[PDB]
Amino acid sequence: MASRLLLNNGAKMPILGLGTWKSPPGQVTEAVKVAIDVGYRHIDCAHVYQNENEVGVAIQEKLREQVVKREELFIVSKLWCTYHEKGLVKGACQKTLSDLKLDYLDLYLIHWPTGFKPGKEFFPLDESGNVVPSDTNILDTWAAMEELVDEGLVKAIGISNFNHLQVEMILNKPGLKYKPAVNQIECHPYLTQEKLIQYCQSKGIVVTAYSPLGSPDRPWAKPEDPSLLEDPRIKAIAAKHNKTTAQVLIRFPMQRNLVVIPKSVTPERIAENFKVFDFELSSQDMTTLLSYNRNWRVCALLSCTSHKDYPFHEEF
Numbered sequence: 321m322a323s324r325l326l327l328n329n330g331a332k333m334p335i336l337g338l339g340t341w342k343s344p345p346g347q348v349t350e351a352v353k354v355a356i357d358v359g360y361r362h363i364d365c366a367h368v369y370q371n372e373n374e375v376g377v378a379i380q381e382k383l384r385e386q387v388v389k390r391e392e393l394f395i396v397s398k399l400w401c402t403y404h405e406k407g408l409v410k411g412a413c414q415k416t417l418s419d420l421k422l423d424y425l426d427l428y429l430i431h432w433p434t435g436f437k438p439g440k441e442f443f444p445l446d447e448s449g450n451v452v453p454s455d456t457n458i459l460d461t462w463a464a465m466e467e468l469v470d471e472g473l474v475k476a477i478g479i480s481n482f483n484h485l486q487v488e489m490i491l492n493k494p495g496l497k498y499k500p501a502v503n504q505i506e507c508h509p510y511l512t513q514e515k516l517i518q519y520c521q522s523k524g525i526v527v528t529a530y531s532p533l534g535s536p537d538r539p540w541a542k543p544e545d546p547s548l549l550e551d552p553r554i555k556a557i558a559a560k561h562n563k564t565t566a567q568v569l570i571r572f573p574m575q576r577n578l579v580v581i582p583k584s585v586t587p588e589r590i591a592e593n594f595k596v597f598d599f600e601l602s603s604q605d606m607t608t609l610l611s612y613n614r615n616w617r618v619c620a621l622l623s624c625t626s627h628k629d630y631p632f633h634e635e636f
C-alpha cells in the first residue's frame with residue numbers, strides 16, 4: 321500500500337488526508353499541527369467550513385518551524401455554491417488562498433454541482449424552504465476553474481458530489497482544457513458508490529471518499545440512525561485485525577484505490593486514524609463491507625432537491 325496516488329495532471333496525492341468540516345476555528349489549528357507531526361501531508365478544506373484562516377495558521381507555523389516544506393503538502397479547498405458565476409470564481413479562490421496564507425492550492429474542487437444565488441448568504445432559501453439557484457451551469461463554471469490552473473493559482477481542479485452524468489458532461493465539454501483530476505464523494509460501507517467509482521476510475525479520475533466514519537458529529541444525527549462505528553459486524557472485523565472500528569473504516573476505501581479524509585480535532589484520534597498502513601483487510605472483508613451498502617447519505621443536500629443540477633436523483 322503506497323502512500324500517494326498519481327493524478328491525471330501528473331501530481332501525486334496522499335491517500336490519507338485530514339478532514340476539517342465541523343472542526344471549530346479555535347481547535348483546528350492544533351488539529352492540523354498534530355496531523356502534520358504524525359505524518360499527514362494532505363488537508364481537506366473549504367471556504368464554507370469557515371475555518372480556513374486557522375488551518376492556514378497551522379500550516380504557516382509548521383513551515384516556519386521547518387517541520388515540512390510547501391512542496392510536501394497537498395492542500396485542498398473547494399469553491400462554494402454562491403460563486404459558480406465565471407466572474408466570481410477567481411475571487412473566491414483568492415479569498416481561500418488569502419485565508420490559508422498560501423500561494424497556490426494543490427487541488428481546487430467545485431464543492432457541489434448546484435449554483436446558488438450570489439450574495440452574502442451561504443444558503444439563500446425561499447418560502448418553500450428550497451434553495452434560490454443561480455443562472456449558472458457546470459460547464460461554464462468548469463471553464464472558469466480551468467483558468468485558475470492556467471494562471472497558476474491551483475495545480476489541479478476537480479469536482480465534488482457530481483453524478484456520473486455530470487462528470488460525463490465535463491469530459492465531453494466543447495473546448496475542454498483540463499479533465500477533472502478528482503471527484504470527492506461520500507463513501508463508506510452504507511454508501512459504497514460502486515458504479516460511480518468504477519466509472520471515475522475507468523476515466524482516470526481519482527475518487528476521494530468523504531465521511532468515511534459516517535460523520536458521527538453531523539448536525540442532524542438521531543439515535544435511530546444507523547451507526548458505522550457501532551455496527552457489530554464491522555466491530556467484529558476490527559477485532560479480528562486488532563484494530564479500532566475507525567481504522568477499519570479508513571483502510572476500507574484505501575484498498576479500493578480511493579483517497580480518504582477522516583476528520584478529527586482530537587490529537588489521539590488524529591494519530592490513531594493515520595495508523596492504517598500496518599494491516600490489510602482480506603478479500604472477504606472487502607466483499608462483506610461492500611455488502612453492507614444501503615444507499616444511506618450523511619450529506620443529501622436536502623434543501624436543494626429541486627435545483628436543476630441536484631446530483632442525487634440519478635442512479636449514480
Ligand SMILES: NC(=O)c1ccc[n+]([C@@H]2O[C@H](COP(=O)([O-])OP(=O)(O)OC[C@H]3O[C@@H](n4cnc5c(N)ncnc54)[C@H](OP(=O)(O)O)[C@@H]3O)[C@@H](O)[C@H]2O)c1
Pocket residue numbers: 338339340341342364365431480481504505529530531532533534535536537538549564566567581582583584585586589590592593618619
Ligand atoms: N465535499 C463534500 O461535500 C464533503 C461533505 C462532507 C465532508 N467532507 C470532508 O470529509 C471530511 C470527513 O468527513 P466528516 O467530517 O463528515 O465525518 P467523518 O470523518 O466520517 O467523521 C468525523 C467524526 O468522527 C469522529 N472521529 C474521528 N476519528 C475517530 C476515531 N478514531 N474514533 C472515534 N471517533 C472518531 C470525530 O470526532 P472528533 O473530531 O471529536 O475527534 C468526528 O466526530 C470532512 O471533515 C470534510 O473535510 C466533504
